[PDB]
Amino acid sequence: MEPPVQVAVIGSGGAAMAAALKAVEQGAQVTLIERGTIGGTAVNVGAVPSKIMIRAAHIAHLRRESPFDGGIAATVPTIDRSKLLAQQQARVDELRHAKYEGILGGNPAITVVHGEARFKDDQSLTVRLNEGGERVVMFDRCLVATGASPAVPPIPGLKESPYWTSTEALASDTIPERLAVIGSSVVALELAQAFARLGSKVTVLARNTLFFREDPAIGEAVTAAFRAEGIEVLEHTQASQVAHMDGEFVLTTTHGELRADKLLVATGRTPNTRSLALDAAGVTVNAQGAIVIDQGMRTSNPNIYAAGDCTDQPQFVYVAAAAGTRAAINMTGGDAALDLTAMPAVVFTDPQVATVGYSEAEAHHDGIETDSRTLTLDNVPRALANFDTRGFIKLVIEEGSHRLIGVQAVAPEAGELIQTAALAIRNRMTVQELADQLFPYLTMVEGLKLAAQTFNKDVKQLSCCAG
Amino acid sequence: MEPPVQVAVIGSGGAAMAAALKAVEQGAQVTLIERGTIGGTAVNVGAVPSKIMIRAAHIAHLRRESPFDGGIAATVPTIDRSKLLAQQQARVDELRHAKYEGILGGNPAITVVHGEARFKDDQSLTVRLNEGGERVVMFDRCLVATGASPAVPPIPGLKESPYWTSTEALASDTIPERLAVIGSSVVALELAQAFARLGSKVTVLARNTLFFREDPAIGEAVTAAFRAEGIEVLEHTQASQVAHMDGEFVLTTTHGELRADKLLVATGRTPNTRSLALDAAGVTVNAQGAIVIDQGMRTSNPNIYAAGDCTDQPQFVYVAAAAGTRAAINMTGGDAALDLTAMPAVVFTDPQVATVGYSEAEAHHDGIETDSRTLTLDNVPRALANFDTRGFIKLVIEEGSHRLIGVQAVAPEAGELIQTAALAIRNRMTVQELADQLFPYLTMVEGLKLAAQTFNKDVKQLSCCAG
Ligand SMILES: Cc1cc2nc3c(=O)[nH]c(=O)nc-3n(C[C@H](O)[C@H](O)[C@H](O)COP(=O)(O)OP(=O)(O)OC[C@H]3O[C@@H](n4cnc5c(N)ncnc54)[C@H](O)[C@@H]3O)c2cc1C
Ligand SMILES: Cc1cc2nc3c(=O)[nH]c(=O)nc-3n(C[C@H](O)[C@H](O)[C@H](O)COP(=O)(O)OP(=O)(O)OC[C@H]3O[C@@H](n4cnc5c(N)ncnc54)[C@H](O)[C@@H]3O)c2cc1C
Ligand SMILES: NC(=O)c1ccc[n+]([C@@H]2O[C@H](COP(=O)([O-])OP(=O)(O)OC[C@H]3O[C@@H](n4cnc5c(N)ncnc54)[C@H](OP(=O)(O)O)[C@@H]3O)[C@@H](O)[C@H]2O)c1
Ligand SMILES: NC(=O)c1ccc[n+]([C@@H]2O[C@H](COP(=O)([O-])OP(=O)(O)OC[C@H]3O[C@@H](n4cnc5c(N)ncnc54)[C@H](OP(=O)(O)O)[C@@H]3O)[C@@H](O)[C@H]2O)c1
Ligand SMILES: [Hg+2]
Ligand SMILES: [Hg+2]
């Protein structure tokens, strides 16, 4: 009779949870090791609390102003951040219980160990237990799903100052009068706008332009939107010194001296791999410290897998979970691979950013010949009816085949409409085929159809829902 | 040398516009006859003004209340309906110019005639001109695209009372203190909620239940939502007498006497065909007065076509436009057919209703064996993060193949997510295939994936974005 496979999982985030559950489903016995709070980043200090805070911010903003203020009075709402934080935290705590702790605890084929794991060799871990002492965890296969942590640039004075990462910002019980933000990508900008809408005077120090690594139309639209609601965006601006004196931050910058009550540093994340003794198990990392893996999540050691933010994978919980599931399949004798060809991504600013597939520049880099169309939102009936035409929908096609290969959008509800684009790309549709489908009038997603139609004719001279 | 085909178009709405433009593109000479305002229903008195008013209502509602009121103060906003109406009307007038009048006037192959057309015979019309007298319009082919008008039930006292249809409601410059609504489908309920949110005390007299012809889960959710925000929904209630006395409506009902300042009657629409002398051209109508057509929009007379609300077609401007385009193709020697298999539909209540493909009941009626899953919105991360879990997402599949054949949703942004469902149905995807696609976390559209996963496993015991 053959014994259950012994699977060790390091972490308890989206990747680890998916792996643990799939491994048990496949008949393995799981030992899961977590050094901090169960659930990792998405539930505790990431996606969930951030989206809640952004929704609160949206309501505050719309109470302050709207495109219908000519006929609907607005007021500046009083904000009780203590109550908002309590509400936010209760949902976080509830979800941690329901989807993480309750699922791990209610399964007898799973042992949770509260401690910090490192590799002893290629078939065992040593765990420094949170209650002191150690245990050894022997395994047949191991998944490393240790995630990442906020990166901190070596700006003089920053290290010893009382600055915030996303964690401390989300956990804060007060809205600061003045918030400085160093960074210019999704964490910085999601949180900058939320804090601004909840009452902070926000200044963003962007070392280049916003969303510098994305199609430049994205940063252009987001920058304009931010400035329109009173967020200061200092482009090509870095702080050379941080100080905290007489109860406030003092930043020395290329733009002059800036003062603020709180400072958010949102300058990327780094993989959590330095405490793992990966060399002891022959697990290779890249120049950023990320664990190198193939499409099956296999490391340089055949019995060790890695998934999620501790690898080079896109840092989205749906990617981490998908990777964990497939790692578990492979740890239990299967043959699975992760396909990210139609992976959507959403930035929860207002307007939202959403992308899927190739930008023009990404396609060019991969040797693909392209064409594109960029439909400004003043051509989308829904945006016109809302009297808010900030943004655009951009479609990228392969030349010759006219297959849709990418979409980038800046729009309210961009995160909803992007999934239609994602399915169109998955199903290898041409823009003509997409345009010939019926879309509902006066929805944002109708903009995909209208953009697709501009490859053939002028949408300006097209009648209502022609197609 | 062969002459341009002479195409007559009756109407100037979505169907007529699409046809006129396509006919010219195909080398025909168009004579378009319109008795009233250019643009017909969607732009002037339908979709556009209604969606604007509903958006205004949404802002008013969120200024009044939200799930975040524990930490964000709310006020009752003053509403200036004169300013809101002016804003609404300016957008209507702008769009009529841009997409209808400017397009017709700027094309020399198009003659617009201001008058009421009827058939003289099967190759000509007589037009009663708005400025008096008549002209004859000879044609080789004719498209009838005359739309529909609000239906009015023969309730004693109603005919001679100063009641509203959707037209008068949308054009009103004041929000009535008390609004009674007779009707229980999309027009009644879209407008009931908009008026309620803008300040009216609204009472809906529904002769059966809300959305009686739809999957019963829809009406159940909408009814609960309406009651939750103080709209009275009187089910199985009809008015047997209308009177207008001492400046108010007095309705005699099965629920007792009801009084209101204004009365909206929203009890369907009827095709505009009685003034057409259709018998003179051998064009057959059905028992409702709708012009009978095939999938190519051809009537009983081979030289006459019909499209839009004057037929039995679904009354959506995107259907009318698609039908008009294809009628024009067929009028100019082509072979086109309209496929409504993946036709989405959206109700702009809050939460929205959206449907595509078959309900369980519709599938059963067509001999299709089905299974289904209904995911309540308290399982959707986005809804949880918004602290608003009103609604559900329901998926209908064919048994055996597991092909997705229908989706019904009641949710905020249901109209956006429904298009992903529409494409999945177009591409003949199984629920397993849909579930294995990556969706963005904390979007409403993620609910489609989560619902799809419940055909295989319990979503309650699934970890974050497992899949
Ligand atoms: C502010 C913010 C907002 C975000 N918003 C979104 C969003 O809207 N949508 C989205 O899809 N994604 C979002 N993300 C990203 C998402 O949170 C991550 O991509 C995802 O949570 C990564 O999951 P994971 O399983 O790889 O790692 P994690 O969830 O980070 O879990 C790793 C776990 O391993 C533990 N650990 C590490 N080392 C050891 C060790 N040696 N021994 C024991 N335990 C260890 C850690 O304590 C941690 O609990 C956001 C992230 C942040 C920071
Ligand atoms: C309140 C309301 C809200 C709506 N909301 C939406 C929505 O959100 N989304 C959506 O897709 N659809 C919506 N609709 C439906 C949409 O407006 C219609 O389905 C669409 O406009 C029909 O277009 P059509 O071309 O068939 O007819 P119409 O646009 O009605 O045009 C018919 C034209 O023919 C003219 N005419 C009639 N008889 C004659 C004659 N004998 N001679 C000359 N001219 C004549 C009329 O004056 C009219 O201008 C809504 C409708 C209403 C009433
Ligand atoms: N909605 C979501 O899905 C979501 C939400 C939050 C986080 N996340 C994920 O979590 C990860 C972390 O996000 P992130 O926004 O922190 O990082 P990121 O997207 O990796 O971007 C790095 C940011 O740091 C800046 N930067 C780096 N070093 C700097 C320095 N020395 N000085 C000033 N600026 C510096 C970069 O500027 P330049 O671009 O100019 O180099 C850029 O703005 C990302 O993968 C992100 O997608 C996702
Ligand atoms: N968002 C959109 O796409 C949109 C918006 C507006 C309109 N439209 C379209 O325009 C058309 C008209 O919509 P509509 O809502 O007026 O009609 P509808 O959807 O055809 O529904 C008819 C309504 O009238 C009721 N009714 C009929 N006779 C009645 C009587 N004698 N007494 C009381 N109630 C009576 C019906 O009740 P029962 O159901 O109980 O019989 C039902 O509520 C529809 O095709 C609609 O889809 C679409
Ligand atoms: Hg349209
Ligand atoms: Hg998730």
Side-chain angles (χ1 to χ4, degrees), chain A residues 1-200 202-273 275-368 370-398 400-402 404-455 458-459 463-467, chain B residues 1-200 202-273 275-368 370-398 400-402 404-455 458-459 463-467:
Chain A
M1 303 185 65
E2 305 307 322
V5 176
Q6 292 288 320
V7 172
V9 176
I10 310 173
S12 66
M17 281 300 309
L21 289 175
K22 184 57 170 176
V24 171
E25 190 264 318
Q26 291 293 297
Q29 190 166 103
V30 175
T31 303
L32 180 144
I33 310 98
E34 169 60 65
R35 68 184 177 190
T37 302
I38 289 284
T41 298
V43 70
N44 294 304
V45 301
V48 174
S50 60
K51 269 74 269 179
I52 291 167
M53 191 163 186
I54 289 164
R55 180 61 183 168
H58 192 84
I59 292 154
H61 177 73
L62 284 179
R63 284 182 177 172
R64 180 176 298 109
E65 62 182 84
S66 81
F68 292 79
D69 288 348
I72 309 179
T75 312
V76 179
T78 301
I79 303 304
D80 185 333
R81 177 58 182 158
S82 185
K83 290 296 181 192
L84 291 176
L85 175 57
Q87 171 181 43
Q88 176 187 303
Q89 193 68 55
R91 182 115 288 172
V92 165
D93 291 349
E94 177 194 58
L95 290 174
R96 187 193 311 113
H97 175 289
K99 287 279 175 182
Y100 300 79
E101 295 163 323
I103 299 193
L104 294 172
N107 196 326
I110 300 176
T111 298
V112 178
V113 183
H114 294 279
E116 187 174 76
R118 66 184 190 276
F119 287 94
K120 170 168 141 284
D121 51 45
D122 85 331
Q123 288 277 92
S124 66
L125 313 170
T126 302
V127 181
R128 293 168 62 83
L129 301 166
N130 291 353
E131 295 188 53
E134 301 187 332
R135 77 157 279 196
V136 171
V137 181
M138 296 176 283
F139 63 80
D140 297 310
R141 302 290 185 279
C142 177
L143 172 67
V144 184
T146 51
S149 296
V152 181
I155 299 173
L158 180 62
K159 180 172 181 191
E160 303 299 332
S161 75
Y163 69 90
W164 285 350
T165 72
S166 49
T167 301
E168 293 83 10
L170 291 165
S172 177
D173 68 352
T174 62
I175 301 297
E177 176 191 302
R178 306 162 296 167
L179 175 67
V181 178
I182 294 172
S184 55
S185 188
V186 61
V187 174
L189 303 174
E190 285 187 353
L191 298 186
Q193 196 177 32
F195 274 94
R197 286 173 168 211
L198 292 165
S200 297
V202 180
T203 303
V204 176
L205 294 70
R207 73 163 169 193
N208 300 304
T209 49
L210 297 196
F211 289 115
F212 182 65
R213 302 98 182 277
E214 301 288 320
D215 185 294
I218 291 165
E220 288 194 39
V222 173
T223 302
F226 274 30
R227 289 176 172 152
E229 62 183 71
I231 300 168
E232 188 170 19
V233 181
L234 302 176
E235 298 168 292
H236 305 282
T237 300
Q238 298 183 64
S240 60
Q241 180 78 52
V242 173
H244 193 268
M245 302 181 295
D246 301 327
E248 66 183 350
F249 286 90
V250 182
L251 311 190
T252 303
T253 83
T254 31
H255 193 253
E257 188 166 286
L258 308 180
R259 295 176 175 271
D261 302 291
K262 297 291 167 171
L263 173 61
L264 172 63
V265 179
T267 55
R269 290 169 70 74
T270 55
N272 294 329
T273 60
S275 293
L276 288 174
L278 290 171
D279 283 341
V283 172
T284 297
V285 303
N286 68 19
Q288 291 73 54
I291 298 168
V292 177
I293 51 156
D294 63 18
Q295 204 168 339
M297 278 55 68
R298 307 165 192 99
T299 70
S300 49
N301 190 285
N303 284 347
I304 305 173
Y305 289 72
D309 296 358
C310 72
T311 73
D312 187 59
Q313 287 175 331
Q315 302 196 347
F316 303 121
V317 71
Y318 45 100
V319 169
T325 296
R326 290 159 177 79
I329 287 168
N330 294 338
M331 286 193 296
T332 58
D335 185 27
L338 180 64
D339 176 11
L340 301 177
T341 312
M343 181 202 72
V346 177
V347 179
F348 294 93
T349 48
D350 179 39
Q352 289 174 356
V353 186
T355 63
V356 62
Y358 289 96
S359 67
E360 291 187 293
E362 290 164 345
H364 292 190
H365 186 79
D366 284 12
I368 302 165
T370 65
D371 197 9
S372 74
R373 290 293 185 283
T374 301
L375 185 83
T376 54
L377 240 62
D378 60 0
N379 295 288
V380 179
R382 175 76 271 168
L384 293 164
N386 290 355
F387 297 89
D388 174 19
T389 58
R390 299 174 292 166
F392 64 89
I393 298 166
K394 182 170 183 174
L395 274 51
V396 181
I397 65 170
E398 181 178 42
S401 71
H402 307 302
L404 185 64
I405 67 175
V407 174
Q408 304 81 42
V410 173
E413 312 318 329
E416 307 299 337
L417 71 86
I418 207 70
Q419 196 65 19
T420 293
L423 267 64
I425 293 163
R426 181 262 183 185
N427 285 292
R428 298 181 62 84
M429 298 183 69
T430 64
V431 278
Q432 292 78 14
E433 288 169 341
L434 187 60
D436 297 1
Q437 308 312 314
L438 298 174
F439 285 65
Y441 188 41
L442 290 161
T443 58
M444 205 63 76
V445 69
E446 185 179 32
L448 289 177
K449 178 196 181 85
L450 295 165
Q453 288 178 312
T454 67
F455 283 94
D458 183 16
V459 141
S463 66
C464 206
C465 301
Chain B
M1 303 185 65
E2 305 307 322
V5 176
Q6 292 288 320
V7 172
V9 176
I10 310 173
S12 66
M17 281 300 309
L21 289 175
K22 184 57 170 176
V24 171
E25 190 264 318
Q26 291 293 297
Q29 190 166 103
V30 175
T31 303
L32 180 144
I33 310 98
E34 169 60 65
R35 68 184 177 190
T37 302
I38 289 284
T41 298
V43 70
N44 294 304
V45 301
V48 174
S50 60
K51 269 74 269 179
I52 291 167
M53 191 163 186
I54 289 164
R55 180 61 183 168
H58 192 84
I59 292 154
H61 177 73
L62 284 179
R63 284 182 177 172
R64 180 176 298 109
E65 62 182 84
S66 81
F68 292 79
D69 288 348
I72 309 179
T75 312
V76 179
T78 301
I79 303 304
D80 185 333
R81 177 58 182 158
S82 185
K83 290 296 181 192
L84 291 176
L85 175 57
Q87 171 181 43
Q88 176 187 303
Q89 193 68 55
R91 182 115 288 172
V92 165
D93 291 349
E94 177 194 58
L95 290 174
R96 187 193 311 113
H97 175 289
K99 287 279 175 182
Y100 300 79
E101 295 163 323
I103 299 193
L104 294 172
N107 196 326
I110 300 176
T111 298
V112 178
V113 183
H114 294 279
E116 187 174 76
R118 66 184 190 276
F119 287 94
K120 170 168 141 284
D121 51 45
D122 85 331
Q123 288 277 92
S124 66
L125 313 170
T126 302
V127 181
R128 293 168 62 83
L129 301 166
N130 291 353
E131 295 188 53
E134 301 187 332
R135 77 157 279 196
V136 171
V137 181
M138 296 176 283
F139 63 80
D140 297 310
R141 302 290 185 279
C142 177
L143 172 67
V144 184
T146 51
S149 296
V152 181
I155 299 173
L158 180 62
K159 180 172 181 191
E160 303 299 332
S161 75
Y163 69 90
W164 285 350
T165 72
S166 49
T167 301
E168 293 83 10
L170 291 165
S172 177
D173 68 352
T174 62
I175 301 297
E177 176 191 302
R178 306 162 296 167
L179 175 67
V181 178
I182 294 172
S184 55
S185 188
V186 61
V187 174
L189 303 174
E190 285 187 353
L191 298 186
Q193 196 177 32
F195 274 94
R197 286 173 168 211
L198 292 165
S200 297
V202 180
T203 303
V204 176
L205 294 70
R207 73 163 169 193
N208 300 304
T209 49
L210 297 196
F211 289 115
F212 182 65
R213 302 98 182 277
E214 301 288 320
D215 185 294
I218 291 165
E220 288 194 39
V222 173
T223 302
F226 274 30
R227 289 176 172 152
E229 62 183 71
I231 300 168
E232 188 170 19
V233 181
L234 302 176
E235 298 168 292
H236 305 282
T237 300
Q238 298 183 64
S240 60
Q241 180 78 52
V242 173
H244 193 268
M245 302 181 295
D246 301 327
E248 66 183 350
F249 286 90
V250 182
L251 311 190
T252 303
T253 83
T254 31
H255 193 253
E257 188 166 286
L258 308 180
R259 295 176 175 271
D261 302 291
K262 297 291 167 171
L263 173 61
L264 172 63
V265 179
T267 55
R269 290 169 70 74
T270 55
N272 294 329
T273 60
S275 293
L276 288 174
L278 290 171
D279 283 341
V283 172
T284 297
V285 303
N286 68 19
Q288 291 73 54
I291 298 168
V292 177
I293 51 156
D294 63 18
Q295 204 168 339
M297 278 55 68
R298 307 165 192 99
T299 70
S300 49
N301 190 285
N303 284 347
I304 305 173
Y305 289 72
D309 296 358
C310 72
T311 73
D312 187 59
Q313 287 175 331
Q315 302 196 347
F316 303 121
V317 71
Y318 45 100
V319 169
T325 296
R326 290 159 177 79
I329 287 168
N330 294 338
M331 286 193 296
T332 58
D335 185 27
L338 180 64
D339 176 11
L340 301 177
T341 312
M343 181 202 72
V346 177
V347 179
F348 294 93
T349 48
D350 179 39
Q352 289 174 356
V353 186
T355 63
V356 62
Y358 289 96
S359 67
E360 291 187 293
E362 290 164 345
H364 292 190
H365 186 79
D366 284 12
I368 302 165
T370 65
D371 197 9
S372 74
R373 290 293 185 283
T374 301
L375 185 83
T376 54
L377 240 62
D378 60 0
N379 295 288
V380 179
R382 175 76 271 168
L384 293 164
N386 290 355
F387 297 89
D388 174 19
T389 58
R390 299 174 292 166
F392 64 89
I393 298 166
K394 182 170 183 174
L395 274 51
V396 181
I397 65 170
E398 181 178 42
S401 71
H402 307 302
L404 185 64
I405 67 175
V407 174
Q408 304 81 42
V410 173
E413 312 318 329
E416 307 299 337
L417 71 86
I418 207 70
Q419 196 65 19
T420 293
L423 267 64
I425 293 163
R426 181 262 183 185
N427 285 292
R428 298 181 62 84
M429 298 183 69
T430 64
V431 278
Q432 292 78 14
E433 288 169 341
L434 187 60
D436 297 1
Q437 308 312 314
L438 298 174
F439 285 65
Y441 188 41
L442 290 161
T443 58
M444 205 63 76
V445 69
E446 185 179 32
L448 289 177
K449 178 196 181 85
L450 295 165
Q453 288 178 312
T454 67
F455 283 94
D458 183 16
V459 141
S463 66
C464 206
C465 301

